């Protein structure tokens, strides 16, 4: 048993977290009551990873649901599968952070963080062999961003030898008008660069553009955005949940995807938004990236791709080798065999063939540059900084977060320019 402890913090984190549990519970044949209703025993072979088995053949998600906002607890309970979560794993405050990172990280969130850590502790200490943790949250708000990164720091203190994985939703003006989100994201990226082992950059800018341009959905809702998120989260966790020739876990993923500790921010991709050649070309298409970055504006350090459905592994192998040869210049020459392919026979709901892409590309700097531009536009005017200094923060902490993120961009640029000879 190699258990993962799942944590969802704040509104966005709990929303994409609930959808994640809905999708994978269906894939594993778990109904809202925790009972298994399944065809294949591939559904239960690696079920420990996300589910605890209570006596009576009931499976309970190893999930901790956290918010400074009381409402989200009831909305989780009333949603489909709200009736599968442990009630003791609901940890909620009364305040609400009002999109204030300092409240989530330093004051109101710190008051509540010990209560969450107790829930983390029952769940972690029951684990046969803990892999680590996966957190869902947004970076633009106050609780998921501020308290989420505080929680990551506190968990790493007690579990320094476990993997810390996050699904981090990046802010975009196309989906949110709240002004301070560039502050909250930069302060969060400052924490994530140091204290997580792997972070999926789920970019609301990319999610909006896919819904609008590709799926032709004007006025996209969060259900539309999260539909892409749940497809992505199902794909990038397929190799953790099902038995495969690769037998993936959170550490093996990090060892193979992260050549340098700070460069651990991944571009997820999904297809279709079919023949195997179509899947492979779409999966590498900039239109199918969940981070608003053009891969042809940088180079891939590492790539992990998972194909799902009944198809020819020979054809997949040929096509993957083919896109590498025809796009040689977009993979770094000094990491041999840096593109790995996996296959899972079980497709997701509603598709017979899908492909999910995890890229560690230096083009991810386009995402951080976009946030850096929005951050500095406000910080040069010191706008709304009293919201943060009012909670006791010092203003050069902003200086350091911006400087650390600018360092991350330059480091990605350094290995984009490096050559073998």
């Amino acid at each position: 048993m190699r258990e993962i402890v799942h944590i969802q913090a704040g509104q966005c984190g709990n929303q994409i977290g609930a959808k994640f549990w809905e999708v994978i519970s269906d894939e594993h044949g778990i109904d809202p009551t925790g009972s298994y209703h399944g065809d294949s025993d591939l559904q239960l072979e690696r079920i420990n990873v996300y589910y605890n088995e209570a006596t009576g053949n009931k499976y309970v998600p190893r999930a901790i649901l956290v918010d400074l906002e009381p409402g989200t607890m009831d909305s989780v309970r009333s949603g489909p599968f709200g009736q599968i979560f442990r009630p003791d794993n609901f940890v909620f405050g009364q305040s609400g952070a009002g999109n204030n990172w300092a409240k989530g990280h330093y004051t109101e969130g710190a008051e509540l963080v010990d209560s969450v850590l107790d829930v983390v502790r029952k769940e972690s200490e029951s684990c046969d062999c803990l892999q680590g943790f996966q957190l869902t949250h947004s970076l633009g708000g106050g609780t998921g961003s501020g308290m989420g990164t505080l929680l990551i720091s506190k968990i790493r203190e007690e579990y320094p030898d476990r993997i810390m994985n996050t699904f981090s939703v990046m802010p975009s003006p196309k989906v949110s008008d709240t002004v301070v989100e560039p502050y909250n994201a930069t302060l969060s990226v400052h924490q994530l660069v140091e204290n997580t082992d792997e972070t999926y950059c789920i970019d609301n800018e990319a999610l909006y553009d896919i819904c609008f341009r590709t799926l032709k959905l004007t006025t996209p809702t969060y259900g539309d955005l999260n539909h892409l998120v749940s497809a992505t989260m199902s794909g990038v966790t397929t190799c953790l949940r099902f038995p495969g020739q690769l037998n993936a876990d959170l550490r093996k993923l990090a060892v193979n995807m992260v050549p340098f500790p700070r460069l651990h921010f991944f571009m997820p991709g999904f297809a279709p938004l079919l023949t195997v050649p179509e899947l492979t070309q779409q999966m590498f298409d900039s239109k199918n990236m969940m981070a608003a970055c053009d891969p042809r504006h940088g180079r891939y350090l590492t790539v992990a791709a998972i194909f799902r459905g009944r198809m020819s592994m020979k054809e997949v192998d040929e096509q993957m080798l083919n896109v590498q040869n025809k796009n040689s210049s977009y993979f770094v020459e000094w990491i041999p065999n840096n593109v790995k392919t996996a296959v899972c026979d079980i497709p997701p709901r509603g598709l017979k063939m899908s492909a999910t892409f995890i890229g560690n590309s230096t083009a991810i700097q386009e995402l951080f540059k976009r946030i850096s531009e929005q951050f500095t536009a406000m910080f040069r005017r010191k706008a709304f900084l009293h919201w943060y200094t009012g909670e006791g923060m010092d203003e050069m902490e902003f200086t350091e977060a911006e400087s650390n993120m600018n360092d991350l961009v330059s480091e990605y640029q350094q290995y984009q320019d490096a050559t073998a000879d």
Binding site: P259, I335, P336, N338
Partner: protein, 440 residues
């Protein structure tokens, strides 16, 4: 006596062990419950197969083998598999967390928690031996356990068993079935650390096996199971001299005298023939001359290299089945006139021949045709250093950037171990160049 103890480390070592021991049982007429009706000495014996099998009073024939893995998934299948009754539970040793493709975790962090138990279980097997002759160690180069734990075990075995012989079957990494980007790192680290502790190592290039399965068994996309069925045939051909006996059977140790001129030059190239589909073999019988000639076709080698562009230091032919010396000698005579076989000036050119009369066995449901005669060539050629060159270059590309090195430093390793390991490989490539230069 002269018992051999097999040690299977990591997924690759364990799964290849499954294939070998299943094949051994079919070759010796041993049932999945360990009973061997043909064996009339109950509870013991001195037969040739007793080198690999001990016997209980209840007539069970038990492999002289230990299986070790740092996680339980793969060995659990042995515990619940077809041949679960073959092994005593203490021969199957598992931890809870694997090395995560990291040599440092297999050697230091995780491996150090289980090494004493493994050595204890090995000592239990060694104490059942009246004349222990040595160890056979199966492992991958690329896995964190296969690389890191094996080298830790080999170091401890040198201490606990002086200079008792230790042979390796080492799985050389190939991109087609690779599991980790850092496999070149693990390969160089384990080759450096194990070099002084191994007397002879048979490298198996997964790409070579992959290509043979595709080309010769018409297998569209070979799996580990396809690869391991072929590998077990080559391993069985090598150990056949230890498990059978006859008037023309040359022991493996006698081949080793010819194959290792200097302690570091202990990596023989294996070439095996014939690998033929049942549909091709039907009505087509391959002669002694044909299977021997196939030993000098590079497409049939266990590791990709070109001995035609290197020099030979030894040539051994291990035949099994309907083979007589007269036909061997004529085949060798023909091949020498027509093939590119250049020996170094300091070695005799003769070929050492062993013949075991029991024909090759095939496991039911496999892709290999049953054939009347097969041969495995063991040659000491400078061309095998090509495998080091390719591996060392992949190492150099990543290490120049220190890519992924932090995963090893974080487990307590130092950069000095990387460069020390790489310098040893550079000296090894130099050694193979020096042995090939004419005398002065």
């Amino acid at each position: 006596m002269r018992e051999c103890i097999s040690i299977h480390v990591g997924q690759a070592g364990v799964q290849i062990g499954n294939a070998c021991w299943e094949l051994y049982c079919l070759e010796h007429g041993i049932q999945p419950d360990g009973q061997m009706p043909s064996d009339k000495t109950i509870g013991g014996g001195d037969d040739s197969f007793n080198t690999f099998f001990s016997e209980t009073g209840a007539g069970k024939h038990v492999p002289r083998a230990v299986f070790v893995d740092l996680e339980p998934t793969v060995i659990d299948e042995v515990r619940t598999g077809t041949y679960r009754q073959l092994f005593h539970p203490e021969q199957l040793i598992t931890g809870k967390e694997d090395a995560a493709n990291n040599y440092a975790r297999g050697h230091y962090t995780i491996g150090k928690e289980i090494i004493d138990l493994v050595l204890d279980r090995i000592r239990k097997l060694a104490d059942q031996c009246t004349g222990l002759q040595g160890f056979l160690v199966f492992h991958s180069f690329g896995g964190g356990t296969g690389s890191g734990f094996t080298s830790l075990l080999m170091e401890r075995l040198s201490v606990d068993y002086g200079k008792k012989s230790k042979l390796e079957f080492s799985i050389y990494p190939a991109p087609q079935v690779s599991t980790a980007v850092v496999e070149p790192y693990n390969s160089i680290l384990t080759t450096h650390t194990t070099l002084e502790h191994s007397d002879c190592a048979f490298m198996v290039d997964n790409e070579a096996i992959y290509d043979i399965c595709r080309r010769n068994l018409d297998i569209e996309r070979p799996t580990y199971t396809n690869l391991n069925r072929l590998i077990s045939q080559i391993v069985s051909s090598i150990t056949a001299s230890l498990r059978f006996d006859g008037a023309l059977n040359v022991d493996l140790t006698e081949f080793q005298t010819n194959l290792v001129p200097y302690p570091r030059i202990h990596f023989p190239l294996a070439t095996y023939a014939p690998v033929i589909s049942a549909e091709k073999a039907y009505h087509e019988q391959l002669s002694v001359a044909e299977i021997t000639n196939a030993c000098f076709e590079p497409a049939n080698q266990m590791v990709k290299c070109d001995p035609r562009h290197g020099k030979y230091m030894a040539c051994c032919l291990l035949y099994r089945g309907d083979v007589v010396p007269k036909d061997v000698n004529a085949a060798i005579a023909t091949i020498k006139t027509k093939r590119s076989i250049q020996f170094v000036d300091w070695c005799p050119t003769g070929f050492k021949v062993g013949i075991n009369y029991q024909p090759p066995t095939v496991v039911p449901g496999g892709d290999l045709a049953k054939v009347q005669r097969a041969v495995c060539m063991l040659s000491n050629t400078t061309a095998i250093a090509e495998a080091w060159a390719r591996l060392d270059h992949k190492f150099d590309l990543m290490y120049a950037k220190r890519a992924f090195v932090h995963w090893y430093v974080g487990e307590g390793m130092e950069e000095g171990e990387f460069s020390e390991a790489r310098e040893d490989m550079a000296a090894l490539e130099k050694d193979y160049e020096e042995v090939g230069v004419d005398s002065v």
